[PDB]
Amino acid sequence: NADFELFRVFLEKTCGIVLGSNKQYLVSSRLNKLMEQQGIKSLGELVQRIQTQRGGLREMVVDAMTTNETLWFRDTYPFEVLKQRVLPELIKANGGQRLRIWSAACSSGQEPYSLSMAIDEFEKTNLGQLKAGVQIVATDLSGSMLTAAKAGEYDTLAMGRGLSPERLQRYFDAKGPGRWAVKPAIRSRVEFRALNLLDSYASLGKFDMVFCRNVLIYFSAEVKRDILLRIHGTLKPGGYLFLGASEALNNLPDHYQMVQCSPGIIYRAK
């Protein structure tokens, strides 16, 4: 168990991905499949990654550290954090003045629809706090995935991934033998707009919260910081940013305050 700290310290220092003495199996399982696609023996890879900008092995290592899967309520913790921590913090501050949420890189639609559900169930528990309506804006590359999001249908198999059978029955109409559609009440809370994260965010306006998870890690360091700096814009002061499981923003002169919750961390904009 000694030749792991060498690896994880590498990732944090360079790729900006943090790990843990526990999750050492969901790692050594996934990259060992890629490592078998070569002659690297756990630490010969560490040195061979430093020849970056050559043959993309570095960018491949980034993969399989992340499930290349689209889940419902990914990691489960940021959505509980949203409900019982962030929204109450934000409700007092604002006086329920229509919170805006950004689902940056929404993909198939799953992440923002999960958010829309989280809102509904917060409104259900904390009645009368649901002043106005929260506006969720989900942005992505003009393509089949965003277009699939707008449709808001979903494979019966895709529903088995990260979604409670309660939430399925409650928030979904079955629109087919093998298909499922988002219920209009949940559907209506989000607006999809096509955007490349490399372009200007001025047209989007300001947000109380931003959800950008498992996105920036697939970028470089110089452009990751750039997007982070532009994400600091379009954020109300004291607004929150969700970066997903094991992403770190080690950079930016402060600006973003690291907020440790018990299950994970979020970032507040200073």
From Swiss-Prot:
Top-rank lineage group of the source organism: Bacteria
Alphabetized SUPFAM superfamilies for the sequence: Chemotaxis receptor methyltransferase CheR, N-terminal domain, S-adenosyl-L-methionine-dependent methyltransferases
Catalysed reactions, semicolon-separated: L-glutamyl-[protein] + S-adenosyl-L-methionine = [protein]-L-glutamate 5-O-methyl ester + S-adenosyl-L-homocysteine
Domain CheR-type methyltransferase: 1-270
Enzyme class of the recorded protein, top EC level: transferase
InterPro entries noted in UniProt: Bact_Chemotaxis_MeTrfase (IPR050903), Chemotaxis_MeTrfase_CheR (IPR026024), CheR_C (IPR022642), CheR_MeTrfase (IPR000780), CheR_N (IPR022641), CheR_N_sf (IPR036804), SAM-dependent_MTases_sf (IPR029063)
Stored Pfam families: CheR, CheR_N
Gene Ontology BP, a term: methylation
Keywords assigned by UniProt, alphabetized: Methyltransferase, S-adenosyl-L-methionine, Transferase
Keyword flag S-adenosyl-L-methionine: yes
UniProt-listed PROSITE patterns: CHER
Molecular function GO terms recorded: protein methyltransferase activity; protein-glutamate O-methyltransferase activity
EC number per UniProt: 2.1.1.80
Keyword Amino-acid biosynthesis in annotation: no
Sites where the protein binds S-adenosyl-L-methionine: N68, T70, R74, E111, D140, N196, L197, R213, N214
Function: Methylation of the membrane-bound methyl-accepting chemotaxis proteins (MCP) to form gamma-glutamyl methyl ester residues in MCP.
Family annotation (PANTHER family): CHEMOTAXIS PROTEIN METHYLTRANSFERASE (PTHR24422), CHEMOTAXIS PROTEIN METHYLTRANSFERASE 1 (PTHR24422:SF21)
Descriptive protein name: Chemotaxis protein methyltransferase 1
Organism annotation: Pseudomonas aeruginosa (strain ATCC 15692 / DSM 22644 / CIP 104116 / JCM 14847 / LMG 12228 / 1C / PRS 101 / PAO1)
Gene: cheR1
